[PDB]
Symmetry: D2
Subunit: 627 residues, 4 copies
């Protein structure tokens, strides 16, 4: 026997919980420090968390976890090299951190140690950028840059205390504004290289690599992108994708132009129904039984009809599917023979699974069993969603495959077209208006997306409810109320979200609205500010406009000049109060709108997320305009 | 709305089992998949059951070959054969 | 069957010669070509067939029919430029509701031929808001200082606490033109806005994203309201002669 | 991408035209519409152009 044992998210032994990985305390302290930064003290905590007790043991734990996840191990020589680099960094950081804590230390000595540490980090960084092993080192790299980006940050805050002149502080601000972009570019380079390479052989391997990066890489990139401020909230909304089925090669231009769009579906709607096209046949005698998954159809909004079949919903060749007012549910043909008795069955049915009473599935059990027969691969399938057994295999017992993650819930169920070209309808597959479907004879795969629990409230109330206790709120762009036409979904995982909106409408206007509600006890007199993250490659003469619409009490909050820049930019509005907007605890049609005029042919612009933070809690510490 | 119906498609009498002179009067075909004598066996019955769903009445389509051998006393003495007609929109259905 | 569209022979009959059937009307042009489902029940997907978002189709084995719609020539400019161009010489402008730039979801088409149009918009959205926008452009020589007024024809059977709102949106220069109390009345009503000028709206001869918006809040289950058409007339040329409130 | 192909499906030799002893070796079927001897004629060729 090869393996009769159960599986856990396709792995032979249970995986570590997403909140119990080795980089979790680092991320937690980073999120804590983003809200309130303890000057000349945060670098010490980051050093104690990355190198506990001046030991590289936590980094080795991270390396082992990543190697276990992505099925790529390193050689002992590379391990020794990385450990030597760790030891050098640890020596220099020990010198610096020890000299800091002496009451009455010399500022010039601290300046020298700071310069030595920054130089050593910059010098040893390229050791983690060898592409031949990047798929692993991209994790370790992510930590090192952090240790650097923290250091410089602290150096900018503690000015003359560490022996820095004003020119030194300005040079450090310039170096920080340069490195916060260079490190992100290099990280994205490694990620895109390895992701495309792994997708060109099988979509499952690329999905696994992406799931690893969503936990060990991208949250820290977002943290970097939020370190220049003080008061915003560090929150990730990336999803984990479980793939069960055969291997399908996918190009990188085909991932962001079709496959990801088919996986996401209605990006702001809750899954309400899922349908499968099941086929079973044991026609001959020497040829064993077999099963096929012909198509998957997810139904989110029952009144929109945007999502279509991924695969096919056909059940016969008699062109009878919607006639007589009913829907064909199952077609079974039983054949009997006679030789001087073994009835054969051919079944083609449509399995339907509606959403549970609690609106969402918590876990699943989906598995496929392969069988070789004269260089021909036959399949058997087992499907169970939550507590409803959807399909038990007729070809024999199949071991389970527990698909679950503590702190996540099932939000989307889709598939990938198998045996067809994935290069068509790229420019047609938009967010709305168009039909989201793709014809294919079979799929033979099921893809389940788990979303974190911080998104469970939006997909249940269709709005964003504000509380008084919290100080900062992050709103992803994909969690909108309505969006304009000719809008696309752009996978931007470095933003710690499931994607961004690409506006490319050449008529009327490009507008995106978000629904806001207020809980009881909310203080309507407290001052707030809005921060909008956008990317405007082409110049827009009318700029970007942030507006508040409340039952006709439309008020203009901000008008920002849209200049050409290929990098992400944050627009900050002036202060305001919820009494100026006319919003109370009973307002149900309150909306925030981000709008711009029509574009030209070949032009587009990107919207990432929104930040709502109180005025007292928000402060810019490192100016971005000083390059 | 269209009621049930039955059809007699062919009759095949077999006298001398080793001569093979008599053939089908009508047709012995049971499907359009060209499968009748493959795999060494003879197709005896093909049943298709269709299920629908409207916000349950399974339909059946049966095509089989009924076989009756000669009795122990070599000959049949009597029989009971009958057909029932039914009109439906100028269409005659049979049982 | 014999089919010919304009000058392109689409299908000549193989079963023999068929006499012609000249489909033409002086002053009209072909705008829509459709058919009717034959041999199937026509009672399904009524609540699903909306103006947008949904798929506009119906499965049927055959149709055996072709239906051609001729529209008058006064609509030829809109279906060619996707906007309404305003001139200085004319004093009054009528804009049907179906000639919009964009419309909200859960909106239906209501055949109201007594309004001398091809139909009216029925809003029945129970979330966000019900909004309808119309694109306006100005020809050269248009006087931007002349005063104008807006008249909105609506039918509001159920009470709307927030009422109806007419607004002018021009590249962010959004200005509120009118806020009208929506009381329950099963008959058609005209709301007249206050006077305004195109300089107050910031619209010139080069504005390409100028829009007029008619909006209202979300409705309740089983509620809807109808919009028929819009009237743009100069202030000097408009006068109410028979008061409608004196019943 | 799949090149052209040809198949020999059946051979039928006819010796004595009035005996009918020899039959098809293979198959004489040409379609799945069960039309071969209807209308008094014999189906000679079925061509489908796509």
């Amino acid at each position: 026997n090869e393996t009769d044992f159960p599986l856990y998210n396709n792995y032979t032994e249970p995986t570590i919980a997403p909140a119990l990985i080795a980089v979790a305390p680092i991320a937690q302290y980073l999120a804590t420090a983003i809200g309130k930064w303890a000057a000349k003290a945060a670098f010490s905590k980051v050093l104690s968390l990355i190198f506990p007790g001046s030991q590289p043991a936590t980094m080795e734990k991270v390396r082992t976890e990543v190697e276990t996840l992505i099925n790529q191990k390193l050689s002992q020589d590379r391990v020794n090299i990385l450990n030597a680099e760790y030891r050098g960094i640890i020596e220099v950081s020990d010198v610096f951190d020890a000299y800091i804590k002496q009451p009455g230390f010399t500022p010039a000595t601290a300046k020298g140690y700071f310069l030595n540490l920054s130089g050593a980090i910059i010098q040893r960084l390229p050791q983690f950028e060898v592409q031949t092993y990047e798929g692993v080192s991209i994790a370790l790299f992510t930590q090192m840059c952090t240790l650097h980006l923290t250091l410089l940050k602290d150096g900018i805050l503690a000015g003359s205390a560490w022996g820095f002149t004003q020119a030194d502080v300005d040079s450090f601000i310039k170096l920080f504004n340069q490195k916060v972009l260079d490190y992100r570019t290099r990280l994205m380079r490694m990620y895109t290289e390895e992701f495309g390479r792994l997708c060109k052989v099988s979509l499952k391997d690329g999905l696994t690599f992406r799931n690893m990066c969503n936990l060990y890489v991208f949250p820290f990139a977002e943290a970097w992108s939020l370190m220049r401020y003080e008061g915003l909230k560090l929150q990730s909304s990336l999803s984990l994708w479980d793939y069960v089925g055969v291997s399908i090669p996918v190009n990188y231009n085909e991932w962001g132009g079709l496959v990801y769009k088919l996986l996401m579906g209605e990006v702001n709607q809750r899954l309400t129904t899922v349908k499968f096209n099941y086929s079973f046949t044991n026609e001959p005698a020497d040829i064993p039984a077999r099963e096929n998954i012909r198509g998957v159809h997810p139904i989110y909004d029952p009144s929109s009809g945007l999502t279509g079949w991924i695969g096919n919903g056909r059940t016969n060749n008699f062109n009878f599917a919607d006639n007589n007012g009913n829907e064909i549910m199952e077609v079974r043909t039983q054949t009997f023979y006679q030789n001087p008795i073994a009835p054969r069955d051919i079944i083609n049915q449509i399995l339907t699974a509606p959403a549970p009473a609690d609106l969402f599935f918590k876990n699943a059990d989906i598995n496929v069993k392969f069988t070789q027969w004269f260089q021909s691969t036959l399949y058997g399938w087992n499907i169970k969603l939550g507590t409803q057994t959807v399909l038990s295999s007729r070809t024999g017992t199949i071991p389970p495959n527990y698909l679950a993650y503590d702190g996540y819930y099932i939000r989307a169920i889709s598939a990938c077209p198998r045996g067809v070209s994935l290069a068509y309808n790229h420019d047609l597959t938009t967010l709305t208006f168009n039909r989201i479907e793709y014809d294919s004879p079979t799929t033979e795969n099921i893809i389940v997306g788990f979303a974190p629990d911080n998104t469970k409230d939006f997909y249940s109330k269709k709005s964003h409810y504000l509380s008084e206790t919290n100080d900062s709120y992050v709103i992803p762009a994909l969690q909108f109320a309505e969006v304009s036409d000719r809008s696309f979904l752009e996978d931007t995982p470095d933003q710690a979200t499931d994607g961004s909106i690409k506006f490319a409408r050449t008529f009327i206007s490009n507008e995106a609205k978000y629904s806001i509600r207020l809980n009881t006890g909310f203080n309507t007199a407290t001052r707030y500010k809005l921060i909008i993250r956008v990317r405007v490659p082409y110049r827009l003469p009318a700029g970007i406009r942030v507006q508040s619409q409340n039952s006709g009490n439309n008020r203009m909050l901000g008008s920002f000049t849209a200049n050409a820049n290929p990098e992400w930019v944050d627009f900050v509005t002036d202060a305001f109060t919820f009494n100026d907007l006319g919003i109370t605890t009973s307002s149900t049609n309150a909306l925030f709108s981000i709008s711009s005029d029509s574009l030209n042919s070949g032009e587009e612009w990107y919207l990432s997320q929104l930040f709502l933070v109180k005025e007292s809690a928000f402060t810019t510490q490192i100016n971005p305009l000083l390059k």
